[PDB]
Backbone:
């Protein structure tokens, strides 16, 4: 989409190359005869002589004469444009421009079906470049590299005194590698440029391209590759550019999946107690008709997608899988237990269709505060698909948001319910039992119901924790566009610790495995009332009516899930 | 403007703090008697109870009740909400909430005329920070600082068991220092937080914030400062957050100025005699009514503007100031940097200009490029988006050797001058055909001998190809037309590595002090008494209003900011 200028002189004939599709400006005035106010152009039927305001159209100060051609040329110097400068002095003098048509096309998957700028939206243009972070040769490799096409319809002797170059910038060299289809090293991290060898006539050359980096602060995510026609007709002067065509790719980002998407594969380890646990997980996986891949003998699995492949990726701190400082900046808040993703959301008009990442930190910097490493936050922010949200999770001894918040599948409203821990519903549930007579039922050491409702230290300890969780509630009701009819509160008692940090009293029921629309909740080991645990009766009476089904286990599991449907390139960040 | 949630229990009365202007949610269902189906709220004339589906509003699963007050409190627990639950077979029970009003305002110059998000445009909201790069004491210092205000209207006993804290992130700490008005050192590069001391009643505290960094790749340009109202009523439990307000600043960028802006003050360097040079400069310098400050016995001067001050800047490799160890290339000098006048490209408007720097056409082993750090620095400043050109074919690598922009009274109000080897040959040929073809040039040579050298006529054809490439690049990326490109005669020659060099002194590298132009001497052919190149350039430039002189050729010219407020442009 970038050509050059053609100046015609009556003194000598001129030779020029016009690439088909490019509107080439013809200078018909700077080199005109001394006196004249007229000019005309009789061209061959293959030359489109466009003019902007024969008919002798006068030599306007600026008269934009542009020229394109229709049929590519195999004859070198065939289409002849002859000008007629007739002013007032003798029959007109005439100038000759012996042109030629060539067709250098660099096509790709810009239409995103599978301007030279990358645009987002249901209507835009752009190519997608996946990263090679997996171990798979031949076709299997051909199916995850991109496919650029270079067609060259040129005269037979055109490439005797012309040459083509395909080059990247010296900033993007290390983030992209290209192979010329056998597949061969063309450009790459050490070589910034390459010259090509193209025979005359029609010769199509297909390229394959891989990225070697994920988007970050140093790398926005856009790569550009350029083809240029360097005219080389004299061996004593440097080469000259006559045409340039570029293309822009965007590297696909790291996308994380929440607990509403249907499961695909589950995993586990061998602490030699699973028999009791794995026996219920194994039943659950086939309750939802899933696959349970046991593993015989801190990890988050997302998906990176292009129009041609949906390769998954693993992140931590095989064939269809993937991978993305250890010394310094190490704390307990750097774990992926401090990372969650909300379901698709709509906040004050804007639509977040892939979710909104959630990580926890402190409320205000101090000397004893803990934070997640800035490198990880910058990495997650560079992935503009899921804009992260900062919460408060430093009042806890561990430092993880998964202690108090979860999301469930649901068949109503936004199609999900936010489960939040609640110290205030446990006290209510205990008091409804004390005011009915059975107030000496034992809990869990072991303690009665009354001895927990008559402890004035635990009550303050839990009032503080409730004041802490309500802040996150308010944060989640404004940055997730939520409403009260979508929050369910699950009873949970807390106690404080070294450095007055919080720790759950009985094992959390908010950190639970959603291997489907019916799931696994850790045992409360709570009071028994009428042959049944009271906490269990309340959580099953709040969750089941939506349509879920709940089990209870005593208590590692990762549930690889289904990539989202919304194509990330159709979103407008 | 965050706030929190208040939960009411019939068992015990509840106390809460409601900051003014924040819509606070009230939980009237989670903790209600198990037999109720109806509820009502009687409150003092100050509590604005807002109910969205005593009228008996039933206990809907999501009946929402939000509260605000239309006043301020100086007494703890002075507004009492009494929620009247009505039992079906039981006399009504009633929860008590003892509210209080406190006002905590953190205001700044967000209206940009003097949401917690920084928005661009004529209708946006944001505050602007200027960088501390001047040697300016207190009186002038408070002139370029920011002015953030914090007003607190609280009961006298409120700040006994409550504490206020102002904090910055552990990333933006190194790029902002905070002073509290006597100015004192509080939150800055080494200290990330500060607990304040506020007396009860009315007490306004002003702050002054300065930045220490320019926008770059590592720093987008936005700095947030947060005020948090905590609660320390119990001495054993950890402190708890009750309210949060925030403000977002943007650091003003580095802006350059083109050759179409009026001059303010020229400069010079008496390295040599240059008596003639100085005379001519001062002459057209007072002719354009611009003061000529001389030096007593490569540097680009921009402007960092804010809604409170337009302090300039100086960039190199009072006033203002802004690296790579070494091994850099000559393409890193500032003769490679130019700025176009405001343009309108395909509907889009660039009202501060569009920067221009040259580099190679395609990377190679012998190619030379401008350092990546400088390009990233310029790209960080989104006001003037740079444009890459081709200048590697020269033996110096500077775009100033063929392009220039002049003032003009027509069309876009300017003309782009480009060097042209093809007009020098034309004028020489007209002067040979007319008869005076043995006039001597500048190793002296005649007109005929230059027109009959076949090594030069190829050296010049290559340069013409390169300059036409640059012309197409400048017509598409600057929205230009062929009625705005005046071509200036110039001949070139090739040297070691086949790089290019001007033959006669470059007349396209000119000093523009308004309608007066110091064009370097061409030392060229004389015809009928005057020089031919001079006659041509005075016949092409003068008609549109300019006036020319010919010195025998360092002068920098500080100028006028376009005054077009950038915060009104939307990049
Ligand atoms: Ca490989
Ligand atoms: Ca998680
Ligand atoms: Ca200072
Ligand atoms: Ca100052
Ligand atoms: Ca310059």
Residues:
């Amino acid at each position: 989409a970038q050509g050059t200028l053609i100046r015609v002189t009556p003194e000598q004939p001129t030779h020029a190359v016009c690439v088909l599709g490019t509107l080439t400006q013809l200078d018909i005035c700077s080199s005109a005869p001394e006196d004249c106010t007229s000019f005309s152009i009789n061209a061959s039927p293959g030359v489109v002589v466009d003019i902007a305001h024969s008919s002798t159209w006068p030599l306007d100060p600026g008269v934009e004469v542009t020229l394109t051609m229709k049929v590519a040329s195999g004859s070198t110097g065939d289409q002849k444009v002859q000008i007629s400068y007739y002013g007032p002095k003798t029959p007109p003098v005439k100038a000759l421009l012996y042109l030629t048509g060539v067709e250098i096309s660099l096509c790709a998957d810009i239409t995103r079906t599978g301007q030279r700028t990358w645009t987002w939206g249901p209507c835009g243009q752009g190519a997608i470049l996946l990263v090679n972070c997996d171990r798979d040769l031949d076709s299997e490799d051909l199916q995850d590299m991109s496919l650029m096409t270079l067609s060259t319809k040129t005269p037979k002797d055109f490439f005797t005194n012309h040459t083509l170059v395909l080059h990247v910038a010296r900033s993007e060299m290390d983030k992209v590698r290209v192979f010329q289809a056998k597949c061969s090293v063309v450009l790459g991290p050490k070589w910034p440029s390459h010259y090509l060898m193209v025979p005359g006539g029609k010769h199509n050359m297909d390229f394959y391209v891989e990225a070697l980096a994920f988007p970050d602060t140093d790398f926005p995510g856009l790569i550009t590759l350029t083809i240029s026609l360097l005219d080389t007709s004299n061996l004593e002067l440097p080469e000259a550019v006559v045409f340039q065509d570029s293309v822009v790719f965007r590297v696909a980002p790291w996308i994380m999946t929440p607990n509403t998407q249907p499961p695909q594969e589950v995993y586990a380890c061998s602490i030699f107690e699973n028999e009791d646990f794995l026996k219920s997980v194994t039943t659950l996986a086939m309750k939802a008709k899933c696959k349970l891949t046991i593993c015989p003998e801190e990890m988050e699995i997302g998906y990176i997608q292009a129009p041609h492949k949906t390769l998954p990726v693993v992140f931590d701190s095989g064939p269809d899988f993937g991978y993305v400082p250890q010394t310094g900046g190490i704390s307990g808040l750097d774990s992926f237990g401090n990372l969650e993703v909300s379901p698709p959301v709509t906040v004050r008009g804007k639509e977040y269709p892939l979710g909104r990442i959630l990580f926890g930190d402190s409320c205000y910097p101090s000397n004893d505060s803990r934070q997640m490493h800035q490198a990880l936050q910058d990495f997650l922010s560079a992935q503009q698909v899921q804009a992260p949200v900062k919460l408060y999770s430093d009042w806890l001894s561990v430092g993880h948001v998964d202690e108090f918040l979860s999301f469930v599948p649901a068949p109503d409203r936004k199609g999900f319910r936010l489960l939040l821990a609640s110290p205030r519903s446990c006290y209510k549930l205990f008091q409804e039992q004390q005011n009915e007579g059975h107030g000496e039922a034992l809990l869990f050491k072991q303690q009665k119901i009354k001895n927990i409702l008559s402890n004035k230290t635990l009550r303050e300890h839990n009032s503080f924790v409730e004041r802490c969780i309500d802040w996150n509630r308010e944060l989640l009701k404004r940055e997730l566009g939520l409403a009260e009819s979508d929050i369910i509160d699950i009873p949970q008692l807390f106690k404080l610790k070294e450095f007055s940090k919080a720790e759950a009293f009985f094992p959390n029921m908010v950190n639970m495995l959603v291997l489907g629309k019916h799931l696994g909740i850790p045992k409360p080991f709570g009071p028994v009332i009428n042959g049944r645990c009271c906490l269990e009766e309340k959580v099953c009476s709040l969750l089941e009516p939506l349509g879920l089904q709940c089990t209870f286990i005593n208590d590692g599991t990762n549930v690889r899930r289904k990539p989202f449907s919304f194509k990330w390139w159709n979103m407008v960040p």
About this structure: Residues 456-476 of chain A form the longest helix (21 residues). DSSP finds seven helices and 38 strands in chain A. The radius of gyration of chain A is 35 Å. Chain A touches chain B through 59 residues (CB under 8 Å).
